[PDB]
C-alpha cells in the first residue's frame, strides 16, 4: 500500500549540482547517459513516439534488444517471485519491489483477474499481459494517456517486438533483426499509408553483442562506443569527434565504480571513495577539490563545492526532501501531502507558496501566491482544463475535443478563438476574434510545408530527409538558403541578396570563428576546460577574461586596458565592483538580503536604498547624498503586478487597465485624462484626451493602420504583399523603393508635380557608404574601417583606429580619459567644450565658451538614472534657464519651461511621436507630427496642414541642414526615437547615454558591455532602418530593427 | 503520342505536367504512381474491375530491394553487398564477394 | 534540387528531390579525390606527384591499378583479379600490340 523500496529556486539548483557529477552519479560510482544526444528520432501523433535510449552500467539485465546496459522504453518487464512478491523494472533500470496500491515513489498499481495495469503520477498508464509459456513474467502490451489515445505492440514468434501500431490500428514502425545476433535490433523502419518504407536508424554490434556503432538514414556515423571484458563502457565518442575515456576499479564491496575520466583536450578528473563514512572526493588537474557525503539510502546530505561553500539536506523515508540549509543558515522547508504531492515551500524570508490538489488525479485545484492572492481551476471529468479564474475574478473558458485538443478559447469580454486540428496532432486552421484565418499545410514526413495568411500570401519551406531546414521562400520570389554539415562543423546562411555568412565550430560545438560577407573575421579562444578566454575583433584588438575556481567571472579587460574586477559573497552574489583605469579606481559596494535581491548600493557619490514587495517587485526607492539632501520614489502595483500608481517629487501618475491588460487610460499630475478605446487590437481605436478627439484609426485585416485622421485632413497608407510600407498619401505622394534585403534605397516625395527623389547606397553588411539627393544640392560619402570606425575620408582610407578611439574627423578633435570617456571636444561651430562625469559614469557638468564667457549646464539625475532637470548658468553663477521633465516608464511624457508645458502623445506603445499638446485650458493647442519611417519628424502641422516647423536632415545624427519657424516659439527637439536635442551643447540625450550627431557615435562606452555588440561606441549600422532608443522596466545597476540586474 | 491506332482498336496515353506517363487506356485501365525521384513504385492494372496492384521498393541509390504483387501470389527480396554484388539472402547478409565473382545463389 | 559549393572549401554536394545528398571532395589541383554516396559508400582515387592516376579504389576495398610511360600514354592496366593488359605504341602514338595476361596463356 506504499513504501515501495528500490536501489539507485536556489535549492533546486544546489540539489541538481550535487546529485550528478562530471553523467556520473555521486553516491553510486556509475554512469547515466541519456539526453537529446541519444534521442535518435521523434514522430508526430496523438501519442508521440520518442526513441530515447539509456545506459546505466548498474542494471543486471545481461541481454536485451540492444545489449548489456542499454535499455529502451518498450522493454518494460514485470516479475513475480516468492514472498521472501511482485517486482517492476523501469526504463532507468531501477528494481522496484512492490510485493503483494499507491506508493510515494510516484507509482500506482492494481491487478485485475486477467492482467495488470500501472499508472504513474500523470495520466500515462501501461498495461501488461502474461508471457506465453511463462506465468512468472509479464510483457508490455499497451500504452495510453488519460484520454483514449493509446499505442499497441505486436510481437513476433519467439516473443520479439515487430510492430508498433497507433490508436487507429495503423502501423507506423517496424523492427528488423539480424542473423548473427537474432536477439539484437539492426534497423528501424517507418511506414507510410502508401505501403512504402524509409529507414531511420541502424545499429552495429561488436563480437560480444554490445552496441558499438550508431548510424543514421544517410549512413553517417553519429556515435561510437567501446567496452571492457565485463561489458563496462570505457570510451564513447560523439558526433563532433570529442572522445571521452573512463576507467573502472574493484572495491571490497565487489561492485565496480568509476575512478578516472579524461578526454583528448587535456581535461581530467579523478575520483576517490570512502564507503565507511560515505565520502566522495573529486579532483581535477587545476587542483580543484569537491566533497560529498551521502547516507545509507544513497541520498546526498552534504555538498561542498570548490569554493568551500557548504550545503546540508534533510531526507525522509520514501525519498522526499524536507529541508535544505545554506552556508548562511537560511532554511528552505517543504511539506507534502498524503499522496506525496508538494503542498508548501517556505524560504528564509518566510514567503510561502501553497497549492491544494485533488484526489482523483494529481491535479492542482487552487494556487496561492505569497501575497495571498489565489488562482482557481476547475476541470473536466477527463482531467482537461475547462476554466481558470484569476484573483481579479476574470474568467477564461476552454473547450476540448474528443482527443484532448483545445478547439475554442473564450476569454473575458466574449472574445472567441477557434481552431481545427489534424489527426496526427498538428494544427491546421487558426482564427482570431474576427473571421481572419491562418492555415497550415504539412508534408508526408510531417513537417510544415507551407503557411497561408489572411490575405492569401504563401510561404514555402523545403526540408531534408532528417527534417533539417534547407530553404525558405516567399510569394514575391525571394529565397533564403541554409547550409549545414552533419559532421563538417560548418554552417552558412545565404541572404536573399546572395551574400553568405559562415560559422565554424569546434569539437565541443562551441562557436570558434565567424566570417561576414566581406571577409571580416571574428574569432574566439577557449581553454582546455571550455572556458572563454579571449574574444578577438575584426581588426585584431582582443578582449580578455579570467575565471575563478567556481567558473564565476572574475576579471574583464577591454581593448584599452581598462579592467573590471568582481568580488563575490558566500552565496554567488557580487558585493564589490572595482574599475581600474588604463595605464584612480572607482569602487561600488553592495549589501543584499539573504536571498539575492539587492538592498543598498554605496558609491563615493552617496547611498541608494531599495525596498521590495514579497513578489520581488520594487515598491520604494531612495537616494541620499553625501552630507546633503534626500529624495525618494514610491510605487503601487495590482494583484497581477500591473503598475497602477507612481509617486515622485513631481507628482502622481495614475493608470487604469482593462481585463485584457491594455492601458485603458492615464491621469497626469495636472489631472487631465488620456483615454484610448481598444477592441483588444483592431479597428476604431481612438484617442480622446479629456473629450477632444485627436486621432481615430481605421485598420486592415492584419491590424495595420490603413487610414489615420489628423483633424480636418486624413492620411492613407498602402502596404506591399510582403508587408513593407510602399506609399503614403495625405488628402482631405510619397513612395519607398526597397532592395532584396529590405533596405531602403529610394524615397520619392512627389508624383503629382516635379518629382524629388533621394538615394542611398549600402554595403552587403548594411553599412551606408553614400547618399545623394535628387536636387543635386547634397552629396555625402562615408568610409569605414573594419569594426565600423568612421574614417576621415580618403586621407585615411586605410588605417586602424586603435581601440575605437576616434580622434579627428574634418575639423573636430577629441580627447579621451583612461576610462574611455570624452573629456574635451574641439570644433569651430561651438568652440571648445569640456565634460565632467560622476562615479556612475554619468554626465553632470558641461562647460562651454561663449561671448558671455564660460557658461555652464548641470544635469540632475533621479535614483534610477533618469533625467529630471537641466539648468544653465552663465558666468558668476547667474542662472539663465531651467527645464524639467516628467517621465512615464522610460518614455518622456511632459516637459516644462518658463510658463510653458508640452505634452507628447505617441502612437501605440513605441517611442514614435504622433501629437504634441501645448498649454492648458482654453489655451490648449493640438499639433501633429509627420514622421519618416524611422520616426524622425520632418514637419509639424497644425490642423489644415500649415507647416509650422519644417526640417531637412543629413543621414547621420539628424544633423540639421535647414530649419524654419514663424511665430511659433516652442522648440522641437525630439529627433530620433528616444532622443531630445540639447541646443546648449548640441548633443542628444537618448535615455542613458549622449549621442554626437557629427560622427554618429556615443560619447561613452556601453554600460552593459559586450551584450550590446563588439563596438562599445556604436549607435547602429545605419540610422534609416535601425533604432536604439535606450542607448543601453527598471535598472537597479547603472538595438532593434525596423551581468546587469533589472526588476 | 497521345493516341495510337493498332487496327480495329485504339490506345490512348495521358501524361503528367512534368512529362511522366501516368495512365494508358485501350478502348475501340493502367496507372503508374511514381516517387519524388521519378522511380516507379506502383502499377495498377484495373480500375473498372477488381484492381490488381503491384509494388516495388528502392533504396536511396535506386537499387531495388523488394517486390510484391497485389494478388499476394508472389514475393521477392534482394540483398546487395557494396559494389552491387547480389547476395544469397540472409545466409550471407554480410560478406565480401571477392572481385565481383558470384559463386553461388540458391541452387546455382 | 539544391547544390552546395565552396569557393575554396573544395567540397560540393547535390541534394536529390527526395532529400538525399551526394558529396564530392577534390584536391589542390582540382582533381576529384573522393566520392560519397547517399549511404556512405566511399569511392576513392589516388594520384601521383605529377597528376597521373595510379589507383582507383572501389566501395568494398578492391582497387584497379594503372601504370604510365614517359609520354603519359597508358601502358598497363590491372583489374581486381590480377588480369593485366599491356599496350604497345608505334612511333606515332598509335597502338599496334595488345597483350592480355591471365590472373595467377596470353
Numbering used by the authors:
A (entry chain A): 268 to 275, 289 to 302, 305 to 366, 371 to 386, 395 to 877, 891 to 1039, 1051 to 1350, 1408 to 1413, ...
B (entry chain B): 1012 to 1039, 1051 to 1130
C (entry chain B): 774 to 877, 891 to 892
Paper passage:
The type VI secretion system (T6SS) is a widespread protein export apparatus found in Gram-negative bacteria.
The raw images and 2D class averages suggest that RhsAΔTMD forms a stable dimer in solution, which facilitated structure determination due to the increased size of the particles. The high quality of the map allowed us to build an atomic model of 75% of the protein, comprising residues 268–275, 289–302, 305–366, 371–386, 395–871, 891–1039 and 1051–1350. The 25% of remaining unresolved regions correspond to the PAAR domain (residues 75–267) and the toxin domain (residues 1351–1486), indicating that these regions likely exhibit a high degree of flexibility. Our structural data show that the C-terminal aspartyl protease domain of RhsA seals the cocoon-shaped structure at one end, while the other end is capped by an N-terminal domain that adopts a smaller structure. This N-terminal domain of the barrel, formed by residues 268–386, caps the cocoon structure in a manner that is reminiscent of how a cork is used to plug a champagne bottle and thus we refer to it as the N-terminal plug domain (RhsAplug).
